[PDB]
Amino acid sequence: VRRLPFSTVSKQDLAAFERIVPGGVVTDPEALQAPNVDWLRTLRGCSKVLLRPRTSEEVSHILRHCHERNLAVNPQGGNTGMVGGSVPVFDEIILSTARMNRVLSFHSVSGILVCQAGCVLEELSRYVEERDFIMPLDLGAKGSCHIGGNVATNAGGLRFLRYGSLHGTVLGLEVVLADGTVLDCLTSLRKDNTGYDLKQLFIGSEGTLGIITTVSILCPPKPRAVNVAFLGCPGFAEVLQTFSTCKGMLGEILSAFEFMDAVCMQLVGRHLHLASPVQESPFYVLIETSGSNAGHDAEKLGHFLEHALGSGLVTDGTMATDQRKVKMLWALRERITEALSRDGYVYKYDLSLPVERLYDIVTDLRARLGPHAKHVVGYGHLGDGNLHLNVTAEAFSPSLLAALEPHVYEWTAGQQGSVSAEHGVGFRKRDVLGYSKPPGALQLMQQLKALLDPKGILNPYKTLPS
Amino acid sequence: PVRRLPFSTVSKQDLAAFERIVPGGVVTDPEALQAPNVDWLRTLRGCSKVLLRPRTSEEVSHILRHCHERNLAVNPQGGNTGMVGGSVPVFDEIILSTARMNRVLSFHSVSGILVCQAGCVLEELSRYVEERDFIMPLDLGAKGSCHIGGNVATNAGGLRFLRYGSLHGTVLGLEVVLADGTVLDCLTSLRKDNTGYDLKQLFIGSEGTLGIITTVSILCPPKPRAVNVAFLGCPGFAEVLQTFSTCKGMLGEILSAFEFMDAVCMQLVGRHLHLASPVQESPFYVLIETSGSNAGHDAEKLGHFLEHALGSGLVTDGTMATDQRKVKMLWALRERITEALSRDGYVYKYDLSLPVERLYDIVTDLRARLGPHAKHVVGYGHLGDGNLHLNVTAEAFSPSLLAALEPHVYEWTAGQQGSVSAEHGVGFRKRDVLGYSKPPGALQLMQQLKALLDPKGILNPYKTLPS
Ligand SMILES: Cc1cc2nc3c(=O)[nH]c(=O)nc-3n(C[C@H](O)[C@H](O)[C@H](O)COP(=O)(O)OP(=O)(O)OC[C@H]3O[C@@H](n4cnc5c(N)ncnc54)[C@H](O)[C@@H]3O)c2cc1C
Ligand SMILES: Cc1cc2nc3c(=O)[nH]c(=O)nc-3n(C[C@H](O)[C@H](O)[C@H](O)COP(=O)(O)OP(=O)(O)OC[C@H]3O[C@@H](n4cnc5c(N)ncnc54)[C@H](O)[C@@H]3O)c2cc1C
Ligand SMILES: [Zn+2]
Ligand SMILES: [Zn+2]
């Protein structure tokens, strides 16, 4: 809210930065406009300097200068973050990883990838898929998000159900600390219990403890067969039983279980002009499988589908194994987030709740907000207990905000839930962590912040309470 | 040797304070304190004069508060199955045992989230969740004695790591009591939660130097409908590696374990524990487990895998079992190697991560470098994870053999950019060999964390960071 007492970038700093990163000092005001606006376009900084380093040493030397001079630094990846973490609040220097986009190694047997933090996820998937491997994560933002940003936010995504957390799949990190110190935790070993797992501190630290410059990550083998079932369910009770049966009948081949409601389908059709492949239903379920024997998987899917259609859990369904049609079906889920931001102003919540009542809050909000909201939708990673709750209006209303907050956060807390399951904290949620974290935890976080960045030059105004 | 730091000593008034804090949980008898003072390997012995056995988190909080005010050093202990001297005192540190913190708090029968006290015994937790058709995400030969809190503190790997991965992924939350007695509540029994720093991660693998784990929340995978085990003889290590490659290619996602052992391992388990080999004599053996939803499909995958393995000469003889009794018998041949080694003599133990292609090289080398001074040398362990268990046995400890083994084994590992402690951790034994696997700047940040969280250093002194 109020600017902390940081120094201001002088002409001497610009000349220093040009020496440190020649060719990588952008000061054109119109060029700085885009990197100052977050993905949602509701926060806008006034940074006048963007730095685009190529190597880790350049990053180390930049922070060295910023440390001695007490200049605030805003690390930025793909700028797809959802919580206002990726753009300055005032005039923080934007340090972009855009040019740190080289792959450093890939071991063709272990599947271990070492790459720079600014490699785009989409591009890394292509690289390892040419070598019969896949990334352990995927997101709708794959086209723009940087692997460094994924690690900094501890991104979940669409294959978390199968491959799990970056806390498990990240093997090593190189991090540049606030004072310029290069921390080498860039191991490429599957197992290494020689002291504290220091890298874990930086996974989910959202650039407040250091800038990730190099990532080592374990890539799963590429599946021989990927199948997608897109199913229509007549209610949420059946969605939950479809999930239960899916785990019983598909089991270890399951790689994704996503859901969306009717309004979500309508919004992707209206704003993005993507047609539904099944009959209209109140709820839709996208199931993905990944396995080593295509015939065994297809056999598992067949028996699962026949009984689920037979027991009335699903009303209408379409299956796909052709690469083109799988991506078609995935687009119906992946592009919901785009359709919402085209419907007007979006109030965005990312909650962890008990799966058995994951949708109850959507129905509650629909009764609580009547004609004062345009749409209320619920979708997301049901398999991981993670609901994406969004309310749209043609324009922002302080009334509607007062109706949504703190009510939504209080409901989640009554369920011992998380007020930010995946997207993190950043600027937007810094003052609502008390609904998921007790004061002693939040205090220790501040002590770690004070140890690693005593001057607070890395990402001020985030991601800890005011 | 190592010098005792200037901690206070336990007085009669401290003993009365502990009797107040945990009624009936103070053990002072020297004959009762012998056993908790000796490590599993029986090569380190402490001189602790008091064992505290709290039942509740509040009791642990109050104990540590007193020790912090009094400047009394504390040695946390679980099952005392640790392999690196971290589990017993060096001098007269108070032994704080989790033996009586053995309650399950809750288990959600759909999400599979378990919450239990740190001192619950792994095998007992497995029995509890398996009755409800879930399994623990980790298993190890120590299951009968090790505590879940110990496993988290050591970041235990084990026999199903290849399938379910690290505790850094499967632990959902922890309650931890800090050195000053502050109860840190990171007990987030949620699959996903990105509301600030993942504080629990600091305590996974910290071996009781940053706090005492009192409650664990852990994600339990579903119990597989079908479990198969194959036990195979290979004519050389190259065929072992090709058997692994082929195994991943043909079994894929149903693979739940891949373990190897050498001929000498098989001989010792047979010689000391009387377990007969079910396959023809071979220089290497491989145990494969599969876990899946469809018995028929898993059987077809396994049938074709063996067909191809026997066809191309990768495996010379093999047997398969699905009967629960027979499955356990095959698993016993691998699980009980560690017991058989310590009955054979004095054991020099090394736990190394290396490039899988050269995992066994060190065993051949050491067999040549040493001579009749080694009674036996073996190599076995978690090949799928790149993890070798190197052991050398002898009739008695000798300085000459230790000098031949060290630093040579640690230099070999650094030469391969490997880990000198893959899973067992650091503790007392390896505190001064971290330079082979971790750079100075990383080692410094760990010391700063220790100073922040335990500025008096009362929690597990003489471990697990460098001097
Ligand atoms: C269409 C869409 C779909 C999405 N789907 C998902 C999803 O399924 N799951 C999910 O979890 N999230 C999802 N997200 C949001 C997700 O958090 C981001 O897309 C991504 O994880 C962040 O990458 P980025 O390069 O955009 O990082 P940025 O937005 O540039 O940065 C995000 C934060 O991390 C910090 N940071 C970035 N890079 C670094 C670095 N190298 N070192 C240190 N700190 C750094 C920034 O300072 C900021 O605080 C989605 C976003 C969009 C737009
Ligand atoms: C037969 C056998 C097989 C084994 N197999 C494996 C294997 O497959 N994989 C593997 O990784 N290891 C294995 N181990 C060793 C492994 O380190 C231990 O078995 C186990 O992980 C430690 O559990 P514990 O409760 O016995 O811990 P302890 O031995 O009691 O303690 C170990 C360390 O953790 C600390 N500690 C213990 N409890 C707590 C607590 N509640 N809070 C904080 N710190 C605590 C202690 O202070 C000590 O430094 C094996 C050991 C044996 C004897
Ligand atoms: Zn998401
Ligand atoms: Zn082991």
PDB file of N, CA, C and O in Angstrom, chain B residues 26-83:
ATOM      1  N   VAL B  26      10.066 -40.906  33.247  1.00  0.00           N
ATOM      2  CA  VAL B  26      11.469 -40.597  33.515  1.00  0.00           C
ATOM      3  C   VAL B  26      12.176 -41.891  33.899  1.00  0.00           C
ATOM      4  O   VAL B  26      11.831 -42.517  34.909  1.00  0.00           O
ATOM      5  N   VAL B  27      13.166 -42.289  33.105  1.00  0.00           N
ATOM      6  CA  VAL B  27      13.953 -43.490  33.368  1.00  0.00           C
ATOM      7  C   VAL B  27      15.382 -43.068  33.686  1.00  0.00           C
ATOM      8  O   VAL B  27      16.050 -42.435  32.859  1.00  0.00           O
ATOM      9  N   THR B  28      15.843 -43.405  34.894  1.00  0.00           N
ATOM     10  CA  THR B  28      17.183 -43.060  35.345  1.00  0.00           C
ATOM     11  C   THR B  28      18.065 -44.259  35.660  1.00  0.00           C
ATOM     12  O   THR B  28      19.275 -44.078  35.839  1.00  0.00           O
ATOM     13  N   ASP B  29      17.508 -45.460  35.746  1.00  0.00           N
ATOM     14  CA  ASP B  29      18.291 -46.640  36.091  1.00  0.00           C
ATOM     15  C   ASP B  29      19.395 -46.910  35.072  1.00  0.00           C
ATOM     16  O   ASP B  29      19.108 -47.018  33.870  1.00  0.00           O
ATOM     17  N   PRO B  30      20.660 -46.997  35.501  1.00  0.00           N
ATOM     18  CA  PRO B  30      21.753 -47.208  34.533  1.00  0.00           C
ATOM     19  C   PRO B  30      21.604 -48.451  33.671  1.00  0.00           C
ATOM     20  O   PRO B  30      21.932 -48.412  32.480  1.00  0.00           O
ATOM     21  N   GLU B  31      21.113 -49.558  34.236  1.00  0.00           N
ATOM     22  CA  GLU B  31      20.918 -50.767  33.437  1.00  0.00           C
ATOM     23  C   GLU B  31      19.813 -50.626  32.403  1.00  0.00           C
ATOM     24  O   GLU B  31      19.912 -51.200  31.310  1.00  0.00           O
ATOM     25  N   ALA B  32      18.759 -49.876  32.715  1.00  0.00           N
ATOM     26  CA  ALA B  32      17.752 -49.574  31.706  1.00  0.00           C
ATOM     27  C   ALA B  32      18.241 -48.588  30.648  1.00  0.00           C
ATOM     28  O   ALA B  32      17.828 -48.679  29.487  1.00  0.00           O
ATOM     29  N   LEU B  33      19.118 -47.653  31.015  1.00  0.00           N
ATOM     30  CA  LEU B  33      19.665 -46.704  30.051  1.00  0.00           C
ATOM     31  C   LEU B  33      20.774 -47.249  29.154  1.00  0.00           C
ATOM     32  O   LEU B  33      21.204 -46.532  28.245  1.00  0.00           O
ATOM     33  N   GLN B  34      21.277 -48.461  29.392  1.00  0.00           N
ATOM     34  CA  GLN B  34      22.298 -49.029  28.511  1.00  0.00           C
ATOM     35  C   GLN B  34      21.807 -49.094  27.067  1.00  0.00           C
ATOM     36  O   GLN B  34      22.413 -48.512  26.160  1.00  0.00           O
ATOM     37  N   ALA B  35      20.701 -49.804  26.842  1.00  0.00           N
ATOM     38  CA  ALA B  35      20.219 -50.081  25.489  1.00  0.00           C
ATOM     39  C   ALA B  35      19.933 -48.820  24.679  1.00  0.00           C
ATOM     40  O   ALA B  35      20.419 -48.729  23.540  1.00  0.00           O
ATOM     41  N   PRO B  36      19.154 -47.843  25.155  1.00  0.00           N
ATOM     42  CA  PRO B  36      18.956 -46.632  24.339  1.00  0.00           C
ATOM     43  C   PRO B  36      20.236 -45.845  24.092  1.00  0.00           C
ATOM     44  O   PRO B  36      20.251 -44.988  23.201  1.00  0.00           O
ATOM     45  N   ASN B  37      21.304 -46.092  24.852  1.00  0.00           N
ATOM     46  CA  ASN B  37      22.584 -45.439  24.598  1.00  0.00           C
ATOM     47  C   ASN B  37      23.408 -46.080  23.482  1.00  0.00           C
ATOM     48  O   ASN B  37      24.396 -45.472  23.057  1.00  0.00           O
ATOM     49  N   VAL B  38      23.069 -47.279  23.007  1.00  0.00           N
ATOM     50  CA  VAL B  38      23.861 -47.955  21.980  1.00  0.00           C
ATOM     51  C   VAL B  38      23.108 -47.905  20.653  1.00  0.00           C
ATOM     52  O   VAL B  38      21.897 -48.157  20.602  1.00  0.00           O
ATOM     53  N   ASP B  39      23.826 -47.566  19.583  1.00  0.00           N
ATOM     54  CA  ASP B  39      23.247 -47.508  18.249  1.00  0.00           C
ATOM     55  C   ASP B  39      22.949 -48.910  17.709  1.00  0.00           C
ATOM     56  O   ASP B  39      23.341 -49.930  18.284  1.00  0.00           O
ATOM     57  N   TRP B  40      22.214 -48.943  16.591  1.00  0.00           N
ATOM     58  CA  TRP B  40      21.822 -50.212  15.981  1.00  0.00           C
ATOM     59  C   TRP B  40      23.032 -51.041  15.577  1.00  0.00           C
ATOM     60  O   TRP B  40      23.024 -52.272  15.699  1.00  0.00           O
ATOM     61  N   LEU B  41      24.074 -50.386  15.079  1.00  0.00           N
ATOM     62  CA  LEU B  41      25.270 -51.105  14.670  1.00  0.00           C
ATOM     63  C   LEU B  41      26.118 -51.554  15.854  1.00  0.00           C
ATOM     64  O   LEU B  41      27.038 -52.356  15.650  1.00  0.00           O
ATOM     65  N   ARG B  42      25.857 -51.032  17.070  1.00  0.00           N
ATOM     66  CA  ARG B  42      26.614 -51.400  18.283  1.00  0.00           C
ATOM     67  C   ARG B  42      28.059 -50.938  18.230  1.00  0.00           C
ATOM     68  O   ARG B  42      28.926 -51.551  18.849  1.00  0.00           O
ATOM     69  N   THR B  43      28.342 -49.853  17.515  1.00  0.00           N
ATOM     70  CA  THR B  43      29.703 -49.350  17.457  1.00  0.00           C
ATOM     71  C   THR B  43      29.828 -47.957  18.053  1.00  0.00           C
ATOM     72  O   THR B  43      30.936 -47.411  18.089  1.00  0.00           O
ATOM     73  N   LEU B  44      28.730 -47.373  18.524  1.00  0.00           N
ATOM     74  CA  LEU B  44      28.767 -46.116  19.252  1.00  0.00           C
ATOM     75  C   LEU B  44      27.958 -46.288  20.528  1.00  0.00           C
ATOM     76  O   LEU B  44      26.872 -46.876  20.503  1.00  0.00           O
ATOM     77  N   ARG B  45      28.477 -45.780  21.642  1.00  0.00           N
ATOM     78  CA  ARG B  45      27.770 -45.865  22.914  1.00  0.00           C
ATOM     79  C   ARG B  45      27.851 -44.519  23.617  1.00  0.00           C
ATOM     80  O   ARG B  45      28.945 -43.985  23.822  1.00  0.00           O
ATOM     81  N   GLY B  46      26.694 -43.984  23.995  1.00  0.00           N
ATOM     82  CA  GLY B  46      26.639 -42.794  24.816  1.00  0.00           C
ATOM     83  C   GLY B  46      26.650 -43.070  26.307  1.00  0.00           C
ATOM     84  O   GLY B  46      26.588 -44.208  26.766  1.00  0.00           O
ATOM     85  N   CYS B  47      26.738 -41.977  27.066  1.00  0.00           N
ATOM     86  CA  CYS B  47      26.733 -41.987  28.524  1.00  0.00           C
ATOM     87  C   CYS B  47      25.573 -41.170  29.083  1.00  0.00           C
ATOM     88  O   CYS B  47      25.702 -40.535  30.131  1.00  0.00           O
ATOM     89  N   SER B  48      24.437 -41.163  28.385  1.00  0.00           N
ATOM     90  CA  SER B  48      23.269 -40.452  28.886  1.00  0.00           C
ATOM     91  C   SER B  48      22.783 -41.094  30.179  1.00  0.00           C
ATOM     92  O   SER B  48      22.753 -42.321  30.312  1.00  0.00           O
ATOM     93  N   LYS B  49      22.396 -40.253  31.138  1.00  0.00           N
ATOM     94  CA  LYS B  49      21.885 -40.717  32.419  1.00  0.00           C
ATOM     95  C   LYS B  49      20.390 -40.483  32.623  1.00  0.00           C
ATOM     96  O   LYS B  49      19.883 -40.772  33.712  1.00  0.00           O
ATOM     97  N   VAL B  50      19.660 -39.993  31.622  1.00  0.00           N
ATOM     98  CA  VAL B  50      18.212 -39.843  31.771  1.00  0.00           C
ATOM     99  C   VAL B  50      17.503 -40.044  30.433  1.00  0.00           C
ATOM    100  O   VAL B  50      17.905 -39.487  29.408  1.00  0.00           O
ATOM    101  N   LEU B  51      16.453 -40.865  30.454  1.00  0.00           N
ATOM    102  CA  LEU B  51      15.544 -41.079  29.333  1.00  0.00           C
ATOM    103  C   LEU B  51      14.168 -40.527  29.679  1.00  0.00           C
ATOM    104  O   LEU B  51      13.580 -40.916  30.693  1.00  0.00           O
ATOM    105  N   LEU B  52      13.651 -39.644  28.830  1.00  0.00           N
ATOM    106  CA  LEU B  52      12.304 -39.106  28.976  1.00  0.00           C
ATOM    107  C   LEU B  52      11.403 -39.686  27.893  1.00  0.00           C
ATOM    108  O   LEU B  52      11.786 -39.725  26.720  1.00  0.00           O
ATOM    109  N   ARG B  53      10.209 -40.135  28.292  1.00  0.00           N
ATOM    110  CA  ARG B  53       9.238 -40.775  27.394  1.00  0.00           C
ATOM    111  C   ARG B  53       7.879 -40.080  27.452  1.00  0.00           C
ATOM    112  O   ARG B  53       6.913 -40.621  28.003  1.00  0.00           O
ATOM    113  N   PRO B  54       7.772 -38.868  26.911  1.00  0.00           N
ATOM    114  CA  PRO B  54       6.483 -38.164  26.943  1.00  0.00           C
ATOM    115  C   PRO B  54       5.424 -38.901  26.132  1.00  0.00           C
ATOM    116  O   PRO B  54       5.728 -39.680  25.225  1.00  0.00           O
ATOM    117  N   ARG B  55       4.159 -38.645  26.475  1.00  0.00           N
ATOM    118  CA  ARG B  55       3.024 -39.147  25.705  1.00  0.00           C
ATOM    119  C   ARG B  55       2.393 -38.121  24.771  1.00  0.00           C
ATOM    120  O   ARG B  55       1.732 -38.518  23.804  1.00  0.00           O
ATOM    121  N   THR B  56       2.554 -36.824  25.035  1.00  0.00           N
ATOM    122  CA  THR B  56       1.806 -35.797  24.326  1.00  0.00           C
ATOM    123  C   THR B  56       2.746 -34.710  23.824  1.00  0.00           C
ATOM    124  O   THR B  56       3.874 -34.560  24.298  1.00  0.00           O
ATOM    125  N   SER B  57       2.247 -33.937  22.858  1.00  0.00           N
ATOM    126  CA  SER B  57       3.020 -32.829  22.305  1.00  0.00           C
ATOM    127  C   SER B  57       3.304 -31.773  23.364  1.00  0.00           C
ATOM    128  O   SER B  57       4.390 -31.180  23.384  1.00  0.00           O
ATOM    129  N   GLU B  58       2.333 -31.510  24.244  1.00  0.00           N
ATOM    130  CA  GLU B  58       2.541 -30.531  25.307  1.00  0.00           C
ATOM    131  C   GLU B  58       3.681 -30.942  26.225  1.00  0.00           C
ATOM    132  O   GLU B  58       4.478 -30.100  26.653  1.00  0.00           O
ATOM    133  N   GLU B  59       3.776 -32.236  26.532  1.00  0.00           N
ATOM    134  CA  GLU B  59       4.883 -32.726  27.345  1.00  0.00           C
ATOM    135  C   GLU B  59       6.225 -32.496  26.662  1.00  0.00           C
ATOM    136  O   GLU B  59       7.212 -32.152  27.322  1.00  0.00           O
ATOM    137  N   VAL B  60       6.286 -32.675  25.341  1.00  0.00           N
ATOM    138  CA  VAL B  60       7.528 -32.414  24.619  1.00  0.00           C
ATOM    139  C   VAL B  60       7.863 -30.927  24.658  1.00  0.00           C
ATOM    140  O   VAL B  60       9.016 -30.537  24.877  1.00  0.00           O
ATOM    141  N   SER B  61       6.862 -30.079  24.412  1.00  0.00           N
ATOM    142  CA  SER B  61       7.027 -28.632  24.538  1.00  0.00           C
ATOM    143  C   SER B  61       7.583 -28.217  25.896  1.00  0.00           C
ATOM    144  O   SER B  61       8.567 -27.476  25.973  1.00  0.00           O
ATOM    145  N   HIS B  62       6.985 -28.714  26.981  1.00  0.00           N
ATOM    146  CA  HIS B  62       7.427 -28.335  28.322  1.00  0.00           C
ATOM    147  C   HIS B  62       8.818 -28.869  28.646  1.00  0.00           C
ATOM    148  O   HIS B  62       9.631 -28.158  29.249  1.00  0.00           O
ATOM    149  N   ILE B  63       9.113 -30.112  28.258  1.00  0.00           N
ATOM    150  CA  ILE B  63      10.462 -30.652  28.424  1.00  0.00           C
ATOM    151  C   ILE B  63      11.502 -29.755  27.759  1.00  0.00           C
ATOM    152  O   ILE B  63      12.501 -29.376  28.380  1.00  0.00           O
ATOM    153  N   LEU B  64      11.288 -29.404  26.488  1.00  0.00           N
ATOM    154  CA  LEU B  64      12.280 -28.604  25.765  1.00  0.00           C
ATOM    155  C   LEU B  64      12.421 -27.178  26.314  1.00  0.00           C
ATOM    156  O   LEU B  64      13.522 -26.625  26.318  1.00  0.00           O
ATOM    157  N   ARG B  65      11.322 -26.570  26.758  1.00  0.00           N
ATOM    158  CA  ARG B  65      11.339 -25.301  27.464  1.00  0.00           C
ATOM    159  C   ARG B  65      12.309 -25.334  28.649  1.00  0.00           C
ATOM    160  O   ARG B  65      13.180 -24.465  28.796  1.00  0.00           O
ATOM    161  N   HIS B  66      12.185 -26.368  29.484  1.00  0.00           N
ATOM    162  CA  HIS B  66      13.075 -26.542  30.631  1.00  0.00           C
ATOM    163  C   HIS B  66      14.522 -26.717  30.188  1.00  0.00           C
ATOM    164  O   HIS B  66      15.425 -26.047  30.703  1.00  0.00           O
ATOM    165  N   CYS B  67      14.762 -27.630  29.242  1.00  0.00           N
ATOM    166  CA  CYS B  67      16.113 -27.835  28.725  1.00  0.00           C
ATOM    167  C   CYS B  67      16.686 -26.565  28.110  1.00  0.00           C
ATOM    168  O   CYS B  67      17.895 -26.326  28.205  1.00  0.00           O
ATOM    169  N   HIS B  68      15.851 -25.749  27.469  1.00  0.00           N
ATOM    170  CA  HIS B  68      16.338 -24.488  26.917  1.00  0.00           C
ATOM    171  C   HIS B  68      16.758 -23.516  28.014  1.00  0.00           C
ATOM    172  O   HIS B  68      17.844 -22.929  27.952  1.00  0.00           O
ATOM    173  N   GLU B  69      15.909 -23.331  29.025  1.00  0.00           N
ATOM    174  CA  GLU B  69      16.269 -22.481  30.157  1.00  0.00           C
ATOM    175  C   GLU B  69      17.488 -23.012  30.902  1.00  0.00           C
ATOM    176  O   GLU B  69      18.356 -22.236  31.317  1.00  0.00           O
ATOM    177  N   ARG B  70      17.582 -24.329  31.070  1.00  0.00           N
ATOM    178  CA  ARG B  70      18.661 -24.926  31.846  1.00  0.00           C
ATOM    179  C   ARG B  70      19.925 -25.175  31.033  1.00  0.00           C
ATOM    180  O   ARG B  70      20.949 -25.536  31.625  1.00  0.00           O
ATOM    181  N   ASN B  71      19.876 -25.010  29.707  1.00  0.00           N
ATOM    182  CA  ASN B  71      20.999 -25.330  28.819  1.00  0.00           C
ATOM    183  C   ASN B  71      21.374 -26.811  28.867  1.00  0.00           C
ATOM    184  O   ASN B  71      22.542 -27.176  28.995  1.00  0.00           O
ATOM    185  N   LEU B  72      20.365 -27.672  28.782  1.00  0.00           N
ATOM    186  CA  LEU B  72      20.572 -29.115  28.733  1.00  0.00           C
ATOM    187  C   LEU B  72      20.414 -29.613  27.299  1.00  0.00           C
ATOM    188  O   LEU B  72      19.393 -29.352  26.652  1.00  0.00           O
ATOM    189  N   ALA B  73      21.429 -30.324  26.812  1.00  0.00           N
ATOM    190  CA  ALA B  73      21.399 -30.899  25.473  1.00  0.00           C
ATOM    191  C   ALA B  73      20.441 -32.084  25.402  1.00  0.00           C
ATOM    192  O   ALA B  73      20.287 -32.848  26.358  1.00  0.00           O
ATOM    193  N   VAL B  74      19.787 -32.230  24.249  1.00  0.00           N
ATOM    194  CA  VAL B  74      18.749 -33.237  24.058  1.00  0.00           C
ATOM    195  C   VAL B  74      19.044 -34.040  22.798  1.00  0.00           C
ATOM    196  O   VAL B  74      19.376 -33.471  21.752  1.00  0.00           O
ATOM    197  N   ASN B  75      18.925 -35.364  22.910  1.00  0.00           N
ATOM    198  CA  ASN B  75      19.110 -36.310  21.813  1.00  0.00           C
ATOM    199  C   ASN B  75      17.755 -36.940  21.515  1.00  0.00           C
ATOM    200  O   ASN B  75      17.327 -37.854  22.238  1.00  0.00           O
ATOM    201  N   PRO B  76      17.029 -36.484  20.493  1.00  0.00           N
ATOM    202  CA  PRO B  76      15.789 -37.175  20.111  1.00  0.00           C
ATOM    203  C   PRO B  76      16.071 -38.591  19.632  1.00  0.00           C
ATOM    204  O   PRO B  76      17.085 -38.855  18.981  1.00  0.00           O
ATOM    205  N   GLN B  77      15.158 -39.506  19.955  1.00  0.00           N
ATOM    206  CA  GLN B  77      15.293 -40.895  19.540  1.00  0.00           C
ATOM    207  C   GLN B  77      13.931 -41.484  19.208  1.00  0.00           C
ATOM    208  O   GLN B  77      12.974 -41.313  19.970  1.00  0.00           O
ATOM    209  N   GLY B  78      13.851 -42.180  18.075  1.00  0.00           N
ATOM    210  CA  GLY B  78      12.686 -42.972  17.726  1.00  0.00           C
ATOM    211  C   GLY B  78      12.905 -44.458  17.930  1.00  0.00           C
ATOM    212  O   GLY B  78      13.091 -44.916  19.061  1.00  0.00           O
ATOM    213  N   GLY B  79      12.872 -45.225  16.837  1.00  0.00           N
ATOM    214  CA  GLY B  79      13.139 -46.655  16.884  1.00  0.00           C
ATOM    215  C   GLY B  79      14.589 -47.029  17.118  1.00  0.00           C
ATOM    216  O   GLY B  79      14.874 -48.212  17.330  1.00  0.00           O
ATOM    217  N   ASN B  80      15.500 -46.056  17.086  1.00  0.00           N
ATOM    218  CA  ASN B  80      16.942 -46.292  17.223  1.00  0.00           C
ATOM    219  C   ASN B  80      17.462 -47.300  16.192  1.00  0.00           C
ATOM    220  O   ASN B  80      18.312 -48.143  16.490  1.00  0.00           O
ATOM    221  N   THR B  81      16.949 -47.210  14.965  1.00  0.00           N
ATOM    222  CA  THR B  81      17.407 -48.018  13.838  1.00  0.00           C
ATOM    223  C   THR B  81      18.311 -47.239  12.884  1.00  0.00           C
ATOM    224  O   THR B  81      18.766 -47.798  11.880  1.00  0.00           O
ATOM    225  N   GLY B  82      18.550 -45.959  13.165  1.00  0.00           N
ATOM    226  CA  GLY B  82      19.429 -45.161  12.329  1.00  0.00           C
ATOM    227  C   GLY B  82      20.817 -45.758  12.197  1.00  0.00           C
ATOM    228  O   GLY B  82      21.311 -46.457  13.083  1.00  0.00           O
ATOM    229  N   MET B  83      21.445 -45.487  11.054  1.00  0.00           N
ATOM    230  CA  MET B  83      22.694 -46.121  10.652  1.00  0.00           C
ATOM    231  C   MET B  83      23.905 -45.200  10.742  1.00  0.00           C
ATOM    232  O   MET B  83      25.013 -45.634  10.412  1.00  0.00           O
TER     233      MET B  83
END
